[PDB]
Short mmCIF file of C-alpha atoms and ligand atoms in Angstrom, two decimals:
data_model
loop_
_atom_site.label_atom_id
_atom_site.label_comp_id
_atom_site.label_asym_id
_atom_site.label_seq_id
_atom_site.Cartn_x
_atom_site.Cartn_y
_atom_site.Cartn_z
CA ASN A 6 -119.85 -51.37 0.85
CA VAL A 7 -122.82 -52.13 -1.39
CA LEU A 8 -125.60 -49.82 -2.53
CA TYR A 9 -128.80 -51.71 -3.34
CA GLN A 10 -131.35 -50.35 -5.78
CA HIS A 11 -134.69 -51.82 -6.78
CA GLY A 12 -135.92 -50.43 -10.08
CA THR A 13 -134.57 -47.17 -11.47
CA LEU A 14 -135.38 -43.46 -11.45
CA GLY A 15 -135.63 -43.22 -15.22
CA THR A 16 -138.17 -46.04 -15.50
CA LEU A 17 -140.18 -44.62 -12.60
CA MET A 18 -140.20 -41.23 -14.38
CA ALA A 19 -141.41 -43.08 -17.48
CA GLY A 20 -144.67 -43.96 -15.74
CA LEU A 21 -144.11 -47.46 -14.36
CA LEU A 22 -145.41 -46.85 -10.84
CA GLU A 23 -146.57 -50.38 -9.97
CA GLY A 24 -145.28 -51.65 -6.63
CA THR A 25 -142.84 -54.44 -7.46
CA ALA A 26 -140.98 -54.99 -4.20
CA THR A 27 -142.01 -55.15 -0.55
CA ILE A 28 -140.79 -52.83 2.23
CA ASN A 29 -139.73 -55.92 4.20
CA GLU A 30 -137.82 -57.23 1.18
CA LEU A 31 -135.96 -53.92 0.88
CA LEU A 32 -135.05 -53.89 4.58
CA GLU A 33 -133.29 -57.21 3.99
CA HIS A 34 -130.71 -55.23 2.01
CA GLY A 35 -130.32 -52.21 4.29
CA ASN A 36 -131.27 -49.88 7.13
CA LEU A 37 -130.82 -46.47 5.50
CA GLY A 38 -132.32 -45.21 2.27
CA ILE A 39 -135.15 -43.64 0.32
CA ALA A 40 -138.09 -44.77 -1.79
CA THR A 41 -141.78 -44.31 -2.49
CA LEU A 42 -144.88 -46.51 -2.58
CA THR A 43 -147.06 -47.95 -5.33
CA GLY A 44 -148.25 -45.18 -7.66
CA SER A 45 -145.27 -43.21 -6.36
CA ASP A 46 -147.32 -42.52 -3.27
CA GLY A 47 -145.47 -40.25 -0.89
CA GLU A 48 -141.93 -40.39 0.41
CA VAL A 49 -140.27 -43.38 2.03
CA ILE A 50 -137.36 -42.81 4.41
CA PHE A 51 -135.37 -45.81 5.64
CA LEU A 52 -133.91 -44.74 8.97
CA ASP A 53 -132.26 -46.95 11.58
CA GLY A 54 -133.78 -50.09 10.08
CA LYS A 55 -137.27 -48.59 10.30
CA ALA A 56 -139.42 -47.58 7.33
CA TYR A 57 -141.33 -44.29 7.47
CA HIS A 58 -143.84 -42.76 5.07
CA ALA A 59 -144.81 -39.12 4.56
CA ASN A 60 -147.67 -38.52 2.14
CA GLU A 61 -149.39 -35.67 0.32
CA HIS A 62 -151.82 -35.30 3.22
CA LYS A 63 -149.19 -34.33 5.79
CA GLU A 64 -149.54 -37.78 7.35
CA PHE A 65 -146.42 -39.51 8.68
CA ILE A 66 -146.28 -43.13 9.83
CA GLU A 67 -144.12 -46.22 10.19
CA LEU A 68 -144.87 -48.70 7.42
CA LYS A 69 -146.17 -52.16 8.31
CA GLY A 70 -143.75 -53.85 5.93
CA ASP A 71 -146.02 -55.41 3.32
CA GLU A 72 -146.44 -52.19 1.32
CA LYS A 73 -145.01 -52.37 -2.20
CA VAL A 74 -142.48 -50.01 -3.81
CA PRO A 75 -141.75 -49.26 -7.51
CA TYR A 76 -138.34 -47.69 -6.83
CA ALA A 77 -136.04 -47.83 -3.80
CA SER A 78 -132.39 -47.31 -2.81
CA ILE A 79 -131.02 -48.76 0.42
CA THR A 80 -127.81 -49.72 2.21
CA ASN A 81 -126.35 -51.16 5.41
CA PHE A 82 -124.94 -47.79 6.45
CA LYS A 83 -121.35 -48.04 7.64
CA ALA A 84 -119.94 -44.50 7.89
CA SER A 85 -116.39 -44.32 6.58
CA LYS A 86 -116.13 -40.63 7.46
CA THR A 87 -117.80 -38.32 9.98
CA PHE A 88 -117.60 -34.53 10.43
CA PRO A 89 -119.66 -31.57 11.72
CA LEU A 90 -121.12 -28.54 9.93
CA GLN A 91 -122.80 -25.37 11.17
CA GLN A 92 -124.70 -22.41 9.74
CA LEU A 93 -124.47 -23.42 6.06
CA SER A 94 -126.73 -23.46 3.00
CA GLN A 95 -127.70 -26.59 1.09
CA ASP A 96 -125.23 -25.77 -1.71
CA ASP A 97 -122.42 -25.22 0.79
CA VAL A 98 -123.29 -28.46 2.60
CA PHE A 99 -123.20 -30.41 -0.66
CA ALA A 100 -119.88 -28.78 -1.57
CA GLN A 101 -118.46 -30.08 1.72
CA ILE A 102 -119.73 -33.60 1.07
CA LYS A 103 -118.29 -33.37 -2.45
CA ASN A 104 -114.95 -32.56 -0.79
CA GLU A 105 -115.05 -35.35 1.80
CA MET A 106 -116.40 -38.19 -0.35
CA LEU A 107 -113.86 -40.60 -1.84
CA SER A 108 -114.82 -39.77 -5.41
CA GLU A 109 -117.61 -38.13 -7.39
CA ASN A 110 -117.11 -40.98 -9.86
CA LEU A 111 -118.57 -43.37 -7.27
CA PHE A 112 -121.92 -43.84 -5.57
CA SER A 113 -122.02 -42.73 -1.93
CA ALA A 114 -124.46 -42.51 0.96
CA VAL A 115 -124.93 -39.61 3.35
CA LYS A 116 -126.53 -39.03 6.72
CA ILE A 117 -126.96 -35.51 8.09
CA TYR A 118 -128.37 -35.36 11.62
CA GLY A 119 -128.96 -32.42 13.94
CA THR A 120 -130.81 -29.11 13.87
CA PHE A 121 -131.85 -27.36 10.66
CA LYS A 122 -132.51 -23.63 10.47
CA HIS A 123 -134.60 -24.27 7.37
CA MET A 124 -136.10 -27.40 5.81
CA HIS A 125 -138.07 -27.57 2.56
CA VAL A 126 -139.57 -30.84 1.29
CA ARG A 127 -142.22 -32.15 -1.08
CA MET A 128 -144.51 -35.15 -0.67
CA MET A 129 -145.04 -36.78 -4.05
CA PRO A 130 -148.81 -37.06 -4.61
CA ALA A 131 -149.99 -40.59 -5.37
CA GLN A 132 -151.29 -41.63 -8.79
CA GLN A 133 -153.98 -44.21 -9.55
CA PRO A 134 -153.65 -46.59 -12.53
CA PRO A 135 -153.54 -46.19 -15.46
CA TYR A 136 -150.33 -44.30 -14.67
CA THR A 137 -148.72 -41.35 -16.46
CA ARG A 138 -145.21 -39.91 -16.48
CA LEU A 139 -144.14 -39.05 -12.93
CA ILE A 140 -143.41 -35.45 -13.96
CA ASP A 141 -147.17 -34.86 -13.82
CA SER A 142 -147.21 -35.72 -10.13
CA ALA A 143 -144.24 -33.50 -9.32
CA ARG A 144 -145.94 -30.53 -10.99
CA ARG A 145 -148.85 -30.74 -8.53
CA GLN A 146 -146.84 -31.88 -5.51
CA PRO A 147 -147.46 -30.29 -2.12
CA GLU A 148 -144.48 -28.71 -0.35
CA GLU A 149 -143.98 -28.00 3.34
CA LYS A 150 -141.29 -25.94 5.05
CA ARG A 151 -140.13 -25.87 8.67
CA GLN A 152 -137.65 -23.84 10.71
CA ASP A 153 -135.28 -24.82 13.53
CA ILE A 154 -136.29 -28.46 13.32
CA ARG A 155 -134.33 -31.46 14.57
CA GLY A 156 -134.16 -34.55 12.39
CA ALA A 157 -132.12 -36.53 9.90
CA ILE A 158 -131.49 -36.34 6.17
CA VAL A 159 -130.56 -39.55 4.39
CA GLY A 160 -129.79 -40.06 0.73
CA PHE A 161 -127.36 -41.05 -1.97
CA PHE A 162 -125.04 -39.46 -4.49
CA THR A 163 -125.11 -40.84 -8.02
CA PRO A 164 -122.10 -40.32 -10.33
CA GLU A 165 -122.64 -38.64 -13.72
CA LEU A 166 -122.50 -41.72 -15.97
CA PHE A 167 -125.27 -43.25 -13.87
CA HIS A 168 -127.67 -40.33 -14.21
CA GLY A 169 -131.02 -41.88 -15.09
CA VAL A 170 -130.42 -45.20 -13.35
CA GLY A 171 -130.14 -43.06 -10.25
CA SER A 172 -130.52 -39.29 -9.88
CA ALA A 173 -128.18 -36.57 -11.12
CA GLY A 174 -126.13 -35.97 -7.98
CA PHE A 175 -127.67 -35.95 -4.50
CA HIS A 176 -131.05 -37.50 -3.73
CA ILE A 177 -132.09 -37.02 -0.11
CA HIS A 178 -135.15 -37.41 2.10
CA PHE A 179 -135.79 -36.02 5.58
CA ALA A 180 -137.52 -37.27 8.73
CA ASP A 181 -137.81 -35.18 11.89
CA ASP A 182 -137.11 -36.62 15.34
CA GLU A 183 -140.80 -36.29 16.21
CA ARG A 184 -141.56 -38.67 13.32
CA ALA A 185 -144.33 -36.29 12.26
CA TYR A 186 -142.86 -34.39 9.31
CA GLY A 187 -140.72 -35.37 6.35
CA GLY A 188 -140.33 -35.87 2.62
CA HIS A 189 -138.07 -35.43 -0.41
CA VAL A 190 -135.67 -32.56 0.36
CA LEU A 191 -135.77 -29.64 -2.09
CA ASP A 192 -133.75 -27.24 0.03
CA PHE A 193 -132.38 -26.82 3.55
CA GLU A 194 -130.08 -24.86 5.84
CA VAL A 195 -128.13 -26.56 8.62
CA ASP A 196 -127.83 -25.00 12.07
CA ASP A 197 -125.73 -27.62 13.81
CA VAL A 198 -125.36 -31.13 12.38
CA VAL A 199 -123.06 -34.11 11.95
CA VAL A 200 -122.39 -35.52 8.49
CA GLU A 201 -121.68 -39.20 7.86
CA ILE A 202 -120.53 -40.51 4.49
CA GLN A 203 -120.09 -43.99 3.03
CA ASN A 204 -118.36 -44.67 -0.29
CA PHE A 205 -119.59 -47.64 -2.33
CA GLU A 206 -117.43 -50.16 -4.17
CA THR A 207 -120.41 -52.13 -5.48
CA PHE A 208 -123.77 -51.05 -6.91
CA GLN A 209 -126.39 -53.82 -6.92
CA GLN A 210 -129.28 -53.15 -9.32
CA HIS A 211 -132.37 -55.35 -8.99
CA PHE A 212 -135.11 -55.64 -11.62
CA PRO A 213 -138.75 -56.80 -11.19
CA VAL A 214 -138.51 -59.76 -13.57
CA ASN A 215 -141.84 -61.09 -12.26
CA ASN A 216 -143.78 -57.93 -13.03
CA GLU A 217 -145.65 -58.26 -16.32
CA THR A 218 -146.05 -54.53 -16.90
CA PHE A 219 -142.31 -53.90 -16.63
CA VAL A 220 -141.42 -56.98 -18.71
CA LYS A 221 -143.79 -56.13 -21.60
CA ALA A 222 -143.56 -52.33 -21.45
CA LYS A 223 -142.13 -50.25 -24.28
CA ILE A 224 -140.47 -47.61 -22.11
CA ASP A 225 -140.14 -44.11 -23.56
CA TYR A 226 -137.22 -42.24 -22.01
CA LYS A 227 -137.66 -39.19 -24.23
CA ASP A 228 -136.77 -36.10 -22.17
CA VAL A 229 -136.36 -38.21 -19.03
CA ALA A 230 -133.11 -36.40 -18.17
CA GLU A 231 -134.78 -32.99 -18.34
CA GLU A 232 -137.83 -34.16 -16.40
CA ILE A 233 -135.69 -35.57 -13.58
CA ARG A 234 -134.07 -32.15 -13.18
CA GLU A 235 -137.46 -30.42 -13.00
CA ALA A 236 -139.12 -33.00 -10.74
CA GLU A 237 -136.50 -33.64 -8.06
CA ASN B 6 -129.11 -64.76 -12.51
CA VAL B 7 -126.53 -62.06 -11.82
CA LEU B 8 -124.62 -60.08 -14.45
CA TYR B 9 -121.27 -58.96 -13.06
CA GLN B 10 -119.46 -55.96 -14.49
CA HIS B 11 -116.15 -54.40 -13.45
CA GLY B 12 -115.92 -50.80 -14.59
CA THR B 13 -118.13 -49.25 -17.26
CA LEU B 14 -117.97 -48.76 -21.01
CA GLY B 15 -118.60 -45.03 -20.79
CA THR B 16 -115.63 -44.61 -18.48
CA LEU B 17 -113.49 -46.77 -20.76
CA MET B 18 -114.48 -44.61 -23.71
CA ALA B 19 -113.46 -41.51 -21.74
CA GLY B 20 -109.91 -42.82 -21.68
CA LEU B 21 -109.44 -44.55 -18.33
CA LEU B 22 -107.75 -47.63 -19.79
CA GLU B 23 -105.72 -48.60 -16.72
CA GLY B 24 -106.02 -52.23 -15.65
CA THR B 25 -107.92 -52.30 -12.36
CA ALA B 26 -108.89 -55.97 -12.07
CA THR B 27 -107.33 -59.28 -13.07
CA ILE B 28 -108.67 -62.09 -15.26
CA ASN B 29 -108.66 -64.39 -12.22
CA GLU B 30 -110.71 -62.03 -10.06
CA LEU B 31 -113.30 -61.90 -12.83
CA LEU B 32 -113.45 -65.68 -13.35
CA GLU B 33 -114.61 -65.80 -9.72
CA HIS B 34 -117.83 -64.16 -10.92
CA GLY B 35 -118.50 -66.15 -14.08
CA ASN B 36 -117.49 -68.41 -16.96
CA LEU B 37 -118.93 -66.54 -19.93
CA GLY B 38 -118.31 -62.94 -20.90
CA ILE B 39 -116.25 -60.24 -22.58
CA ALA B 40 -113.49 -57.77 -21.72
CA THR B 41 -110.17 -56.20 -22.74
CA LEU B 42 -106.75 -55.78 -21.14
CA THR B 43 -104.86 -52.80 -19.72
CA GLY B 44 -104.73 -50.04 -22.33
CA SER B 45 -107.79 -51.54 -24.02
CA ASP B 46 -105.52 -54.10 -25.67
CA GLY B 47 -107.42 -56.54 -27.86
CA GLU B 48 -110.53 -58.61 -27.21
CA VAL B 49 -110.95 -60.88 -24.20
CA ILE B 50 -113.43 -63.74 -24.46
CA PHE B 51 -114.56 -65.71 -21.41
CA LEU B 52 -115.84 -69.07 -22.66
CA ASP B 53 -116.50 -72.23 -20.67
CA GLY B 54 -114.47 -70.89 -17.76
CA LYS B 55 -111.38 -70.09 -19.81
CA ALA B 56 -110.17 -66.60 -20.71
CA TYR B 57 -108.95 -66.08 -24.28
CA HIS B 58 -107.34 -63.00 -25.79
CA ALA B 59 -106.95 -61.92 -29.40
CA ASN B 60 -104.84 -58.82 -30.08
CA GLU B 61 -104.29 -56.43 -32.98
CA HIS B 62 -101.52 -58.72 -34.24
CA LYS B 63 -103.87 -61.64 -34.94
CA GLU B 64 -102.54 -63.53 -31.92
CA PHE B 65 -105.06 -65.75 -30.13
CA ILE B 66 -104.00 -67.19 -26.77
CA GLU B 67 -105.30 -68.35 -23.41
CA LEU B 68 -104.53 -65.72 -20.78
CA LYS B 69 -102.52 -66.84 -17.74
CA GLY B 70 -104.91 -65.14 -15.35
CA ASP B 71 -102.69 -62.41 -13.89
CA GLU B 72 -103.38 -59.94 -16.70
CA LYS B 73 -105.36 -56.82 -15.78
CA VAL B 74 -108.54 -55.50 -17.38
CA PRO B 75 -110.07 -51.99 -17.28
CA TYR B 76 -113.57 -53.15 -18.26
CA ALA B 77 -115.23 -56.57 -18.02
CA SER B 78 -118.65 -58.25 -18.17
CA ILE B 79 -119.12 -61.84 -16.99
CA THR B 80 -121.67 -64.33 -15.69
CA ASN B 81 -122.12 -67.91 -14.48
CA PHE B 82 -124.09 -68.76 -17.59
CA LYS B 83 -127.33 -70.67 -17.25
CA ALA B 84 -129.73 -70.75 -20.20
CA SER B 85 -133.27 -69.44 -19.60
CA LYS B 86 -134.37 -69.93 -23.21
CA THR B 87 -132.90 -72.26 -25.85
CA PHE B 88 -133.76 -72.31 -29.56
CA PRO B 89 -132.24 -73.01 -33.00
CA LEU B 90 -131.59 -70.64 -35.92
CA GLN B 91 -130.40 -71.30 -39.48
CA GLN B 92 -129.31 -69.23 -42.48
CA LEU B 93 -129.81 -65.81 -40.86
CA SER B 94 -127.84 -62.56 -41.00
CA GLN B 95 -126.75 -60.65 -37.90
CA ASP B 96 -129.74 -58.30 -38.03
CA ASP B 97 -132.27 -61.11 -38.34
CA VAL B 98 -130.62 -63.09 -35.54
CA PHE B 99 -130.67 -60.10 -33.19
CA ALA B 100 -134.36 -59.63 -33.98
CA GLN B 101 -135.01 -63.26 -33.05
CA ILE B 102 -133.08 -62.83 -29.81
CA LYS B 103 -135.04 -59.69 -28.93
CA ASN B 104 -138.18 -61.78 -29.47
CA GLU B 105 -137.00 -64.74 -27.37
CA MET B 106 -135.53 -62.79 -24.45
CA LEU B 107 -137.77 -62.11 -21.46
CA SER B 108 -137.68 -58.32 -21.88
CA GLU B 109 -135.74 -55.67 -23.77
CA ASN B 110 -135.90 -53.71 -20.50
CA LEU B 111 -133.58 -56.22 -18.80
CA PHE B 112 -129.94 -57.18 -19.21
CA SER B 113 -129.44 -60.60 -20.81
CA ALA B 114 -126.56 -62.81 -21.89
CA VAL B 115 -126.38 -64.79 -25.12
CA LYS B 116 -124.39 -67.76 -26.36
CA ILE B 117 -124.68 -68.65 -30.03
CA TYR B 118 -122.86 -71.88 -30.88
CA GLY B 119 -122.56 -73.77 -34.15
CA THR B 120 -121.49 -72.99 -37.70
CA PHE B 121 -121.35 -69.49 -39.18
CA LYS B 122 -121.39 -68.72 -42.90
CA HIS B 123 -119.58 -65.46 -42.15
CA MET B 124 -117.71 -63.97 -39.19
CA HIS B 125 -116.29 -60.45 -39.02
CA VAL B 126 -114.40 -59.34 -35.92
CA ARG B 127 -112.01 -56.56 -34.91
CA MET B 128 -109.16 -56.46 -32.39
CA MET B 129 -108.97 -53.16 -30.51
CA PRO B 130 -105.39 -51.87 -30.94
CA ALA B 131 -103.65 -51.27 -27.62
CA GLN B 132 -102.85 -47.81 -26.27
CA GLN B 133 -99.84 -46.77 -24.20
CA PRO B 134 -100.00 -44.37 -21.20
CA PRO B 135 -100.86 -41.60 -21.06
CA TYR B 136 -104.20 -42.68 -22.52
CA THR B 137 -106.67 -40.86 -24.76
CA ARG B 138 -110.29 -41.29 -25.90
CA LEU B 139 -110.73 -44.96 -26.84
CA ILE B 140 -112.43 -43.76 -30.03
CA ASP B 141 -109.01 -43.04 -31.56
CA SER B 142 -108.06 -46.70 -31.15
CA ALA B 143 -111.16 -47.94 -32.98
CA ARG B 144 -110.26 -45.52 -35.79
CA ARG B 145 -107.32 -47.73 -36.79
CA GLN B 146 -108.43 -51.15 -35.59
CA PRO B 147 -107.55 -54.36 -37.47
CA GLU B 148 -110.34 -56.57 -38.82
CA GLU B 149 -110.34 -60.22 -39.86
CA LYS B 150 -113.09 -62.15 -41.61
CA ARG B 151 -113.74 -65.87 -41.96
CA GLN B 152 -116.24 -68.20 -43.60
CA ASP B 153 -117.93 -71.46 -42.64
CA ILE B 154 -116.37 -71.45 -39.19
CA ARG B 155 -117.55 -73.35 -36.12
CA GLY B 156 -117.37 -71.54 -32.80
CA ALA B 157 -119.30 -69.58 -30.22
CA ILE B 158 -120.51 -66.02 -29.93
CA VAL B 159 -120.89 -64.83 -26.34
CA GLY B 160 -122.09 -61.46 -25.18
CA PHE B 161 -124.68 -59.34 -23.44
CA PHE B 162 -127.68 -57.16 -24.21
CA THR B 163 -128.02 -53.86 -22.38
CA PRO B 164 -131.42 -52.19 -21.89
CA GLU B 165 -131.81 -48.59 -23.12
CA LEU B 166 -131.58 -46.73 -19.80
CA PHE B 167 -128.23 -48.39 -19.16
CA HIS B 168 -126.61 -47.31 -22.43
CA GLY B 169 -123.24 -45.94 -21.35
CA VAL B 170 -122.93 -48.06 -18.22
CA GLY B 171 -122.99 -50.94 -20.68
CA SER B 172 -123.21 -50.91 -24.48
CA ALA B 173 -126.22 -49.80 -26.54
CA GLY B 174 -127.95 -53.12 -27.16
CA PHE B 175 -125.86 -56.15 -28.10
CA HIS B 176 -122.15 -56.45 -27.30
CA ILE B 177 -120.71 -59.75 -28.47
CA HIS B 178 -117.34 -61.44 -28.96
CA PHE B 179 -116.41 -64.62 -30.81
CA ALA B 180 -113.97 -67.52 -30.47
CA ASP B 181 -113.76 -70.52 -32.79
CA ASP B 182 -113.58 -74.10 -31.49
CA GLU B 183 -109.97 -74.28 -32.68
CA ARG B 184 -109.26 -71.39 -30.32
CA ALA B 185 -107.06 -69.54 -32.80
CA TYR B 186 -109.41 -66.85 -34.11
CA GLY B 187 -111.72 -64.39 -32.41
CA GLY B 188 -112.47 -60.87 -31.26
CA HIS B 189 -115.19 -58.23 -31.12
CA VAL B 190 -117.99 -59.19 -33.50
CA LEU B 191 -118.90 -56.55 -36.09
CA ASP B 192 -121.04 -58.75 -38.33
CA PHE B 193 -121.96 -62.37 -39.00
CA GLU B 194 -124.29 -64.86 -40.68
CA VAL B 195 -125.29 -68.08 -38.96
CA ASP B 196 -125.43 -71.36 -40.85
CA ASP B 197 -126.58 -73.82 -38.18
CA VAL B 198 -126.60 -72.72 -34.54
CA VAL B 199 -128.35 -73.03 -31.19
CA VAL B 200 -129.02 -69.88 -29.20
CA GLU B 201 -129.09 -69.74 -25.41
CA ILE B 202 -130.29 -66.65 -23.55
CA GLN B 203 -129.95 -65.85 -19.85
CA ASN B 204 -132.34 -63.21 -18.48
CA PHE B 205 -130.80 -61.22 -15.63
CA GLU B 206 -132.67 -60.19 -12.50
CA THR B 207 -129.64 -58.52 -10.93
CA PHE B 208 -126.89 -56.24 -12.26
CA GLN B 209 -123.79 -56.18 -10.05
CA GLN B 210 -121.57 -53.20 -10.88
CA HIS B 211 -118.11 -53.18 -9.32
CA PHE B 212 -115.89 -50.08 -9.06
CA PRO B 213 -112.08 -49.72 -8.76
CA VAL B 214 -112.09 -47.80 -5.47
CA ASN B 215 -108.34 -48.37 -5.14
CA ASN B 216 -107.39 -46.93 -8.53
CA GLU B 217 -106.10 -43.42 -7.78
CA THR B 218 -106.60 -42.35 -11.39
CA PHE B 219 -110.27 -43.36 -11.48
CA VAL B 220 -110.79 -41.91 -8.01
CA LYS B 221 -109.28 -38.47 -8.71
CA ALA B 222 -110.17 -38.36 -12.40
CA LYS B 223 -112.59 -35.75 -13.76
CA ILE B 224 -114.19 -37.95 -16.40
CA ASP B 225 -115.59 -36.24 -19.49
CA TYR B 226 -118.53 -38.01 -21.11
CA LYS B 227 -119.28 -35.37 -23.73
CA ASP B 228 -120.35 -37.12 -26.96
CA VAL B 229 -119.62 -40.53 -25.43
CA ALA B 230 -122.95 -41.79 -26.75
CA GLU B 231 -121.98 -41.11 -30.37
CA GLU B 232 -118.43 -42.39 -30.01
CA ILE B 233 -119.89 -45.75 -28.97
CA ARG B 234 -122.12 -45.95 -32.05
CA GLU B 235 -118.94 -45.60 -34.09
CA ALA B 236 -116.39 -47.48 -31.98
CA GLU B 237 -118.54 -49.81 -29.84
ZN1 ZN C 301 -137.18 -38.74 -3.59
ZN1 ZN C 302 -115.96 -55.58 -27.35
#
């Protein structure tokens, strides 16, 4: 039960958007997760060992594998608990997961598959170097909503003390069965779905020690906590 | 280069002082590091594969291995950078280390061996269940100084974004060659030493998923950042 993370949310938010790991390299550590590409281009969804990408132009494709990522979270999903849910809001769905998870003091992974009455996502717009704080991208991000759509939500829960390294609470992405729509979930309403949870005993954090920008950078985390809450 | 850590400092500060891992389990992950025992009793020093423990009563011994620890940091030490230092105070030595390490944005381990003009350590007084904020223990901790003493300082550096998960910057312990004096370093002045630094590419964080307390606990981190600047 290990959650693998390449880079961190706080450092990404700080403006270090250079791709430092390969999609293929990430897949070596898991089959379910979330991420983004160099320049924080779009939304990466790791689903069933495959890597998908939804960008700011409503495009949706399966990544070749050589694309680079500045921040990614992945795991070899092994559900330790499964249970259904119907006709519930995002808040109510999270409250259920909060009830079924082993502990909110631990990291955990979730998978929600089925039909969604409502789905609301954003596709982080890509930046070109020199980079700026990621909050600037989020403030001009496109958002797309759908209704009565079938797909899967995948993500992770980060415990309080780890806010910054990961995200404050749930961080989830969506990919529809048609593999034509998806992104970072901002809101949703389940119609009929199945929820799978996995509690982690180990958190493996990897750093891009070979990336000169990261190594030499003087990272400013001023207001990073507040920005993360506005951006995601 | 993997830095292994069982539990977190922030959680320890909150009061969860129950022993959730043994000295032996930790030695399986390294030969150089720091820790404390159940109830945050004293200062554990992992040096050259052996685990030493100095308590509030000035007792310095070699743990048997079955003792439990609530928080621990350890690594299979391998120097990435080696260099000498002479006649320098703690502040000047830390500055040199920050200059010689690969990046202040990474975790790193240090081993400073040789003679020290001055050595000032403290031995965290133990607490008995039920436990309270570890800050109260530091507010009545013993402290012993020495002069012209040969030994080794071993510890870790924690990048900014990880303050809380680990300490804020340097966290070092000491143990003399005579193995009869040591503890948490509060200050020092090197006479003639050699410094070895290990730059970490991976941070492995382990959690006590079987510790009911930790699992069901509603950990309060309010003001934890400031209590570490005081207690550390
Ligand atoms: Zn996202
Ligand atoms: Zn200490």
